[model samples]
Target: QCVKLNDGHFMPVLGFGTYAPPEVPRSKALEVTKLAIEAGFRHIDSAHLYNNEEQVGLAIRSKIADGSVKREDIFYTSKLWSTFHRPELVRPALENSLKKAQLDYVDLYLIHSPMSLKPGEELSPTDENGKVIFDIVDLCTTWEAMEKCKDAGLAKSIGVSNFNRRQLEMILNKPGLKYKPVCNQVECHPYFNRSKLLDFCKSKDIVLVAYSALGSQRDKRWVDPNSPVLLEDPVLCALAKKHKRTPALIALRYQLQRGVVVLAKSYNEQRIRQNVQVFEFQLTAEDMKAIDGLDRNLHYFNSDSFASHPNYPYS
Candidate 1:
C-alpha cells in the first residue's frame, strides 16, 4: 500500500523483483520489463548486486521515451552491493547504480544489509567467536553517503535492508542526521512471519518492505533441494479456494492487509499480471486467521549462509 519512505508516494504493493535474472540478458530484462509495465506493474525492484540495472535502466528510459509509461509513474528501487561497503566506496557505489538505472533519482535507495560485507568474501555481523560484529559502524560511514544521496537529490529517501531492531536503534541515536531510514527491507512471509520485528518497526514508523512474499520458490539453488514450496501450500490453496483466489494472492495480501508493503517476484507475465490483481479483491478476516494458523515457521531462504563469517546476518 504505502510504507516505502515515499510517505505520500504509493508503492504498487506488488513489485516485479529481478533477483537472479539480472544476468539473464539485457534483451530479456527489457522485454520482461516492458511486459511488466504493460501488465500494470508500476513498481520495479532491482539492485547493483543483481548486475542488470543497465538493462533495467534501458527499459525504463526507453519506456519513458516511448508511449508505454512515464518515469514518474514508476517506483524504482536499487541497493548498494556489499562489496562497496567500505565507507569511501559509497559514493562510487551509488554512482554505479545511478548510471545503471539512468535515473536522476530513485524513489527509494537501501543499504542492502547491516554488515559491511563483500561480494564473495565470508564475513559475519559478529566477531570470530560468535560475538556480534556490528561493523555497520563502518557501514554508517556508507549510510552518511546514502543520506548524501538525498541531499544531492539522487534518492528521494534512504533506507536499510535486513537491519535488526537493535542496529536500527543505534543509527537513530547517532548525531548530525539529516535523513532517517524510512524503510527497512526484510524477509517476511506466513511461515516466517516475524511478529516482534514488525512491532519494533511500527513503533518507529519505519516502513517494512517484505521480500519472498509468495515464498521465494525461485531461489532454490542457494537453499536446500527439499525446502517447502510457498505457492504449493495446501492451506494457502484452501484459503484461496475459500476466497475464490490463488494461494499466491493470499500470501501477498497477507502482508498488505497487515500494514506491510509486500514485494512479489516473477518473470512470467501471466503470474505478474495475476499478482497485481490482489488489490482488486480483499480476503476475509476468517481466511486470514486460517492462513496465519497454518504457520510452520518454515523458511526456504535463510540469508544466514553469509553468517559464515563474523558480522553475519545468520548469526
Candidate 2:
C-alpha cells in the first residue's frame, strides 16, 4: 500500500533501491529495475549520485511500454547531490537528472545529505592530501531552492536524506518555510532502528523512508569491515524459521510494521521477486519487540569521510 506525504502525494511503502557497488555494471540497473517492476515494486528509489538515472528511467519507460505500468503508477525519486547544495545549483542539477532520465519530473526529490561539498565536476572534491573539501552554504538557503523546484513542478514532493533532528528542525523552522520535507530517508535496519528520529518525524507528519533496510551492500568505501551481517543474526534467523520467511523478508517486514517506508535492494532476479513477499506475512507484536532489541545504533553505511564537515548528520 501507499502512504500520503505532507505534500499530498502518495508514496508506496515498499520501494526498490537502485544503489549498487561501482563494480556492478550500469546495465544491471536497467535489467534488475525492470525485473523489480515485474515483481511488483512500484516505488523506485534512485539518486543522482547512483549514476544510473538513465537506466532506471529506461526501465520505467520499458515497463510502461509493455503495458505493465503507467507513468502515473510508478513513483520515482532522485536526490540532489552534495556538490549541488548551493541554491543556484539546485534546479540545474535536478534538470540534469531529468534530462538524463528523459522524464518530465520526478515524484520525489531529496537533498542527498545535509553536508555540502565544494561545487565542482568531482562528486567528492578532495584536495591533494585527500581531505574532502567542504562548502559553507546554509542548508536553509538550499532548502529555499528546493521549495522553488517544487513550485516549478520539477519535483512532486521534496525531502531530505541523512538528516538528524536538528537539521530537520532547521528546515521546519525556517522563517518563510513554504514546505516541510515530506520524509527523511536514511540508513535504517533492525540493527540501527533510529527509533528516536522515527518518533520525531512521525510527530511532524514526515515519513521516515529507510535505506539499507536489509543491512547494506557493505561497499568497502562506506560500510565498516567488522560490522555484523544483519540477515545472519540469530534473532532474525530464528524468526525467519518461525515464520518460514527469509531473514531479509523479516527485516523488511519489521520496518513496515514500525510505520517506516522500506527500500529493498537486490540485483538478483529471484531475490527481487522474493522481497515482495514482505507484504504477504505479518510479524507478531512479540516478534516486533525482539527485532527492536536488536538495535545497537550501528550504521552500516557510515560516511566517515564527511564526518569532519560542519553539517555531518551522524555527528
Best by lDDT: 2
Please provide TM-scores, in order, for all candidate models, with all chains considered together. 0.88, 0.99
268-304 per-residue lDDT for model 2 (tens digits): 9999999999999999999999999999999887676
Off by over 4 Å in 2: none
Model 1: worst 10 consecutive residues (lDDT sum): 118-127
Report per-prediction Cα RMSD to one decimal: 3.9, 0.8
lDDT of 1 at 112: 87
lDDT of 1 by residue, 181-251 (tens): 88888878888777677888888878788888887755544566677777788889888888788888889
lDDT of each: 0.75, 0.95
Clashing pairs in 2: none
Q: After superposing candidate 1 on the true structure, give the runs of residues whose Cα lies further than 4 Å from its correct spot.
A: 1-10, 21-23, 118-137, 218-220, 303-305
At residue 189, give the lDDT of candidate 2.
95
